[PDB]
């Protein structure tokens, strides 16, 4: 289960796997100075985001005010106007995701980046101060193989290297929306996963990481190398 607020290393993964999913985009350049465009690549690039920094209510298609509003207050940053914009269904399409949260982002950005640890500053003292979170520049494979993380306390061997992969969360729960699919892991191969890890604590990370890697032996490994920055 999602844990909230959501921290830096969190926001920066939501940010950087949406990027990968979408590279070819013509807008990729302008999302980077936090910009985002009218364009289709940029509404899909915008729910993903949504989705991937645990905002999304996949059930009832709306966001997550409560969790939203939540992101701010403990960042100590006001709440902004036009919530009520951001607020209710959406009929389930990026554009309209996009419609709903683009004002809400434009007249708000420098306080949205400070809340989701946008800034380089606020970004790189979350990490100087959380040492037990993997650095920006490490591996996912350096940081885990130390200090005996892939444990998990137990008798794991894969219980780090599932969490910062995004196969489980924290309370080792398989995270249900991944998409795998540009490595070679269909959503019904990454479903099939889900599905085979009623098991208990960090075996439910090792069984995600032991059912991925059986459908494409490289696909972990891209995510490693991709790991240094996401
Ligand atoms: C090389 O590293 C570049 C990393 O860039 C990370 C910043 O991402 C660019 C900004 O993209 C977004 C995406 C979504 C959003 C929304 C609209 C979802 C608002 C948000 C993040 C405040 C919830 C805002 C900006």
Redesign the pocket.
Known sequence: MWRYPRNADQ??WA??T??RQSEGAKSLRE??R?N?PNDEDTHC??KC??LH?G?YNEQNKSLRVDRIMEQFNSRSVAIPGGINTISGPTDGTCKDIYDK?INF?NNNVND?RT??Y?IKKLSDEWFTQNSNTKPKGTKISDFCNAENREKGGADCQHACSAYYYRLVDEDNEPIHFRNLNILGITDEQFASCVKASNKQGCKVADTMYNCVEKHNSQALKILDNQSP?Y
């Open positions: 926001t920066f940010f950087r949406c990027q999302w980077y936090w985002l690039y915008v985001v949504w920094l905002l949260t982002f949205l809340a989701f946008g920055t």
